[PDB]
Amino acid sequence: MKKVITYGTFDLLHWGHIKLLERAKQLGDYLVVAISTDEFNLQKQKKAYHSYEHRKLILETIRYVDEVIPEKNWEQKKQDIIDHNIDVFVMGDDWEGKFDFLKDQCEVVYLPRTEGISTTKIKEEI
Amino acid sequence: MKKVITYGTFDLLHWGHIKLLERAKQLGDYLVVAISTDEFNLQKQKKAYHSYEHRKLILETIRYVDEVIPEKNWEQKKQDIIDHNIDVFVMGDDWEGKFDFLKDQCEVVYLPRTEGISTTKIKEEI
Ligand SMILES: Nc1ccn([C@@H]2O[C@H](COP(=O)(O)OP(=O)(O)OC[C@@H](O)CO)[C@@H](O)[C@H]2O)c(=O)n1
Ligand SMILES: Nc1ccn([C@@H]2O[C@H](COP(=O)(O)OP(=O)(O)OC[C@@H](O)CO)[C@@H](O)[C@H]2O)c(=O)n1
Numbered sequence: 122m123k124k125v126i127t128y129g130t131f132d133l134l135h136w137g138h139i140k141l142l143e144r145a146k147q148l149g150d151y152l153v154v155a156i157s158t159d160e161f162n163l164q165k166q167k168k169a170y171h172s173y174e175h176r177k178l179i180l181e182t183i184r185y186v187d188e189v190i191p192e193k194n195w196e197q198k199k200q201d202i203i204d205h206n207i208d209v210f211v212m213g214d215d216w217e218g219k220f221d222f223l224k225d226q227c228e229v230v231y232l233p234r235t236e237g238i239s240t241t242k243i244k245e246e247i
Numbered sequence: 248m249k250k251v252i253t254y255g256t257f258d259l260l261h262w263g264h265i266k267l268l269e270r271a272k273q274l275g276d277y278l279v280v281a282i283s284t285d286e287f288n289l290q291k292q293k294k295a296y297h298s299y300e301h302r303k304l305i306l307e308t309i310r311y312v313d314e315v316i317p318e319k320n321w322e323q324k325k326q327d328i329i330d331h332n333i334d335v336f337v338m339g340d341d342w343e344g345k346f347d348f349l350k351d352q353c354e355v356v357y358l359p360r361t362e363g364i365s366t367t368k369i370k371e372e373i
Pocket of ligand 1: 128129130131132137138141157165192211212213214215232233234235236237238239
């Protein structure tokens with residue numbers, strides 16, 4: 122089995138998030154998503170409108186997602202790969218190159234973001 | 248096969264919608280979701296931040312959802328229920344009593360809304 126993993130906040134779920142999860146799942150045959158806690162989201166200079174409990178609730182229902190775990194800190198990644206027998210690590214390309222240190226453990230893939238949509242555009246126009 | 252159908256806009260999909268779809272599917276073996284077109288939304292004196300195309304895309308990925316069709320007008324219910332062989336019509340109880348005219352065709356049920364969350368709240372708080 123080819124196991125894939127991706128990390129993120131996924132607040133105010135939109136079609137750009139959907140498209141990221143879609144391609145990620147299709148890079149293998151099982152997808153794990155580590156969703157950022159509200160404490161960690163803050164370490165990213167961000168504040169989620171939806172709570173961790175509710176953000177995880179919604180994401181667990183999306184077909185592409187097989188299971189959800191919490192993202193608590195930056196250092197947990199290498200162990201996550203070992204614990205979940207991960208074969209592919211994926212993120213949107215705004216993280217291009219930031220996680221190349223995991224290449225010696227698994228395949229690393231950066232997916233081009235979906236142009237035209239973001240959580241900032243949503244709040245701003247709303 | 249016990250078929251269920253439900254109608255709605257589902258803009259800015261949140262946890263309240265998810266719990267409605269979860270309990271809707273719990274009622275039968277298959278769930279059809281008829282999503283309000285941007286044109287029909289106007290007839291309900293509303294305007295969705297997310298277009299139909301995008302609201303349908305995300306919705307289609309929810310595991311509880313087997314099939315999606317457009318809700319174009321108020322009158323299509325009778326014909327829809329016949330076309331899709333629906334056995335159970337369900338809506339959140341903020342619509343209680345409003346669709347009882349369908350009882351001569353199928354089983355009508357109302358589920359208690361999820362208090363504390365709504366599309367308007369998200370917009371006003373943002
Ligand atoms: N239009 C968009 C918006 C987002 N994304 C992707 O959505 C995923 C995560 O969305 P975020 O909520 O912004 O999570 P993020 O802050 O990028 O996670 C950062 C950290 O958890 C990494 O360890 C990312 O892979 C991002 O590239 C995308 O492809 N297209
Ligand atoms: N906290 C909430 C919010 C919404 N809902 C349910 O979500 C479904 C639809 O959400 P809406 O986007 O508000 O669509 P609506 O305008 O209610 O549909 C109207 C019309 O199409 C019916 O013929 C409804 O069954 C509603 O009761 C809920 O149970 N709990």
